[PDB]
Amino acid sequence: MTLFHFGNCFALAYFPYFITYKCSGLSEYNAFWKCVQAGVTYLFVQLCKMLFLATFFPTWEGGIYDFIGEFMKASVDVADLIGLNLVMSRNAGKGEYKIMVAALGWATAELIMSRCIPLWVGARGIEFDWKYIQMSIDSNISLVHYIVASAQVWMITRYDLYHTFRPAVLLLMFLSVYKAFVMETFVHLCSLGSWTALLARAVVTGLLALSTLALYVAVVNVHS
Amino acid sequence: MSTMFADTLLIVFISVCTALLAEGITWVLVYRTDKYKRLKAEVEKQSKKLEKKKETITESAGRQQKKKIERQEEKLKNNNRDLSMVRMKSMFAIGFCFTALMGMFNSIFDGRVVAKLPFTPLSYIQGLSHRNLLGDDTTDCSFIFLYILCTMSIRQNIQKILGLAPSRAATKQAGGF
Amino acid sequence: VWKAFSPTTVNTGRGMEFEGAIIALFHLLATRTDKVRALREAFYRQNLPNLMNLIATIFVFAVVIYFQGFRVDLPIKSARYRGQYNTYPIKLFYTSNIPIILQSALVSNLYVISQMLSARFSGNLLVSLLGTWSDTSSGGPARAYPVGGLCHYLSPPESFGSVLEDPVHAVVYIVFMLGSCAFFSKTWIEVSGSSAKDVAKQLKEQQMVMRGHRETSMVHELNRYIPTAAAFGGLCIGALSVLADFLGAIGSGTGILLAVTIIYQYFEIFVKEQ
Amino acid sequence: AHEFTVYRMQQYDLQGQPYGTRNAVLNTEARTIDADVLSRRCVLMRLLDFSYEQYQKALRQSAGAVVIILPRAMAAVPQDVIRQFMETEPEMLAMETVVPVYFAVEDEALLSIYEQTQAASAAQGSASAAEVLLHTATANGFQMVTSGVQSKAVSDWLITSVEGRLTGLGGEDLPTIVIVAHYDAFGVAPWLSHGADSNGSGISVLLELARLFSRLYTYKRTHAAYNLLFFASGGGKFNYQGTKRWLEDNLDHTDSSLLQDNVAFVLCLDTVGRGDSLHLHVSKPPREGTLQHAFLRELEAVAAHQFPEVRFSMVHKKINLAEDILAWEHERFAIRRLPAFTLSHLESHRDGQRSSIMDVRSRVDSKTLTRNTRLIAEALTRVIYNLTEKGTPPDMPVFTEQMQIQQEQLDSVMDWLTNQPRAAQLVDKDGTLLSTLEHYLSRYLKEVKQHHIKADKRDPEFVFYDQLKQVMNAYRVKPAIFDLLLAVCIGAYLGMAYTAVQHFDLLYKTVQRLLVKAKTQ
């Protein structure tokens, strides 16, 4: 039973990434090594973020939910955008290719670092918990969110981006960076159940994806 | 129909279902693939050309024909290794399915005697025939042992009926790998 | 690697702590609600190898490789074959790790002799001059430190705090290390047969001649650079070792230098044979 | 997960015979008795619903374990259920079972788990196979795991008995009367074997008698011409091993002259805390003119005259040497040829009350205990001082006013005894119970000594086992059918994702058309 739950969680977390990799044509471009490099960049950025937080921010001893601490973590999440920009600049190709390579490598590296060890230890436990399935869905939500963030960073980094679009891109990037903090604050405030929190995260990610896609299409058409 | 024979029949049915599932997985991952079809056809064509050349090649064939045989054996061995690796991917998938199947069997047949053996198993196989059974009767058959026998019987027969069995030429060359 | 990744748990009075800096960091991050505080503790742990110490080691390793790459290329031509240009690299660390090895072996023998003399003949003036040893079990595995004498002056200060407490000791240690490394490098070149004359003889045996210069001229040019390269390289090696020791790099500044240079030489041997 | 404390059915060997449960490790799914297949399952039974036939059914079906849930208030539990359990308990202990049996005190989480398991077990029969599959898939299973290791024999357990003496006016040569009570408790679960009546009541009577005799012996005017020995025996329920060792040490050794020739009689007190019937169990009827006969006559006279409510009678049982376990403590003395008798409210030693975890402080009546103590004290004093020959009428109580029995003290002693389980496998030499008992005896008696008996290594008369108390963890679990359905759902989700990615170009074109239309408008 424990093996069945672990296998289901691992399959649900991993197969969507493989499907995206094959369908997007990255396999055709032999992008696997570029994705590995992106994951290494993610590891470096995450280490830098942890070092920055430890060096500059003492832990608050207040029992009440650390609103300042979560806000600071979201502010530090800008480092992930900087790393994605660095990866895209390092990677040569069409904008869609750069966005997809950066997003896939970043999301895969986060998934490996943050969820595989918890999946391995927890899902093989005797006790069945929905949390592992929820985390497997959350990894897919993270993958979509990273795709959206990479597309936004590419659009903002475009030299030809019109000034009218630029504030919209900046606002979308701001929302993407602060999405985790906003979701945690909302879940804490409403005492939302884990399924409701996952659904809300999915809805917010979908809305961000749709807005980013619409802006991307508008920017591409304005130059086509 | 006593629960023991019902369990026996259920195990036979499960072995059939698992053989069909393993063949379906192998078909989806291997048999349908163009790489597999191509490698299989290449192996058969090279084997037949090698045999026909060995038959046509008298001792008077000369070092050059011998070297052509060696080069064809090398090509056949390489193609057979690639074919084996493709089959091995299916073997791994079936292994994972077998891990899942063992969990299902534990959930259904734990501690239950599923069949009576008409013979005393040899001490080296008793650890399988009486595995996870309560009792001293070494003629008690464990679900693991009955499933193994059923799978060994059914899988090859199903492959042969469906024509999915590896070709005898491919098996003869796989003997080398 | 063991200090970085050891899974052994050592019972510090507060709690059981992983010896390995990385494993301890992951365990603390998983088990502690104060993730930032746990990370800071892992970076600045008093009693176990720190992540900051590991980062310092990595920085030292990169710096050492960068200095290792410094070379002076002398153009040599085959006399027999026209147009064949090769460079004779005079490395900055011309004398290799051998000055470090000789200095460390001499210091090791001095410490062994001093400890024996202190154990067998307590209170003799010569014994006190050579070294006085005290076993400091200050909340740690017992370590015998030389608290007085030449062995005390030769011992590395454990931290910048100790350097601040005893500035004279740190200055004496630094001067001794630099002087000994330079002296050993100069002596080693003469003893080893790696002098400019010997290198010129090897080039003559290999039928390699510098363009426009006779073999004697080659000897003069090599003699200009090799002694300077040896002495400056030894001084740089001593300075790098002292800096890494002050930075607290895991495995010691001397150890890191030895490992990097040995690996580089082995790699060069591997490439040459290949 | 939910963690709760479980008390394992005791494991011991007596005279080479195995008793109780041999296994202590459980890793099985929880089920109720209603489930058709209990094999390798943890069977949950409530004491209210507990039946011996159901327990036997589980053993026959080779249940993985049995967990018996005890109501928090034993007094609250209906008396009939307790009586039935007490009757079944000796048979359960006598029967060796491979299946581990545990006792758990009821907890709200445990009750909720029990109800959920009962509903899951019942639902399988009532519904069509598709509905049963859906119910099983949505149902939460519970997996019971014991944290403890397998039980092991204790090679060096020591049973300790405490003796104290009061010398009569005339020295050690005077006739010695020995009052004996075993302090050890016995029951299906040692941690639940409080043994309030058996034999906390007897110990309380013995201590009160010790206090009264000590006070009488303090003053020369009231000083008797008898030796009194008070013996608190260990391992009474295990064939009186402490008494046997104490008798061997006193009688085999010539230096211990007190017992060889000076023993007037031995009065053993067992289960004197309850009931209006009092039975004097004698291996041999006392001969006329013997001190034991005088004591019997005095006890009958006091019961008839001062306490007519108490029905006193003499029960004669011949000693059967063939039986592995002696019926009464006095039998050991009779085997050694010492005149001895046991006073108990129980008609028979085989009564389930004598060896039950249900013997709790609420069962013991303070008034009954005080009355029995007074009757025993009066009879002993009348024998010791020969009051009847001196012409003192039977109706007159000696123990009045200054010598009155203290009900509050008896209650405090009973509470102290019942506060902790006194099972022989739990009573360590250094235990608080023994140290307190020794101090209390030492206050009133002289020459208090502790006698320690150890089982022989070559031929151990008794062997005790550990792992009597363990923590059991209930883990929530989902069935394999549920996992299979989840796998199918995941496969469908992956197929939908693949189709959506393949058809994303249609979405891109639709968005482009919508944006163009919005620009045009």
Curated annotation (Swiss-Prot), chain C:
Keywords: Developmental protein, Endoplasmic reticulum, Membrane, Protein transport, Translocation, Transmembrane, Transmembrane helix, Transport
Ranges in the topological domain labelled Lumenal: 6-50, 116-165, 247-252
Keyword Transport assigned: yes
Gene Ontology process terms (BP): cotranslational protein targeting to membrane; post-translational protein targeting to membrane, translocation; pronephric nephron development; protein insertion into ER membrane; protein targeting to ER; SRP-dependent cotranslational protein targeting to membrane, translocation
Positions of transmembrane segments: 51-68, 95-115, 166-188, 230-246, 253-267
Localization: Endoplasmic reticulum membrane
Chief location bin: endoplasmic reticulum
Domain of life of the organism encoding this protein: Eukaryota
Subunit structure: The SEC61 channel-forming translocon complex consists of channel-forming core components SEC61A1, SEC61B and SEC61G and different auxiliary components such as SEC62 and SEC63. The SEC61 channel associates with the multi-pass translocon (MPT) complex.
Function: Component of SEC61 channel-forming translocon complex that mediates transport of signal peptide-containing precursor polypeptides across the endoplasmic reticulum (ER). Forms a ribosome receptor and a gated pore in the ER membrane, both functions required for cotranslational translocation of nascent polypeptides. May cooperate with auxiliary protein SEC62, SEC63 and HSPA5/BiP to enable post-translational transport of small presecretory proteins.
Family: Belongs to the SecY/SEC61-alpha family.
Official protein name in the record: Protein transport protein Sec61 subunit alpha isoform 1
Organism: Canis lupus familiaris
Chain's gene name: SEC61A1
Residues of the full protein shown: 192 to 465 of 476
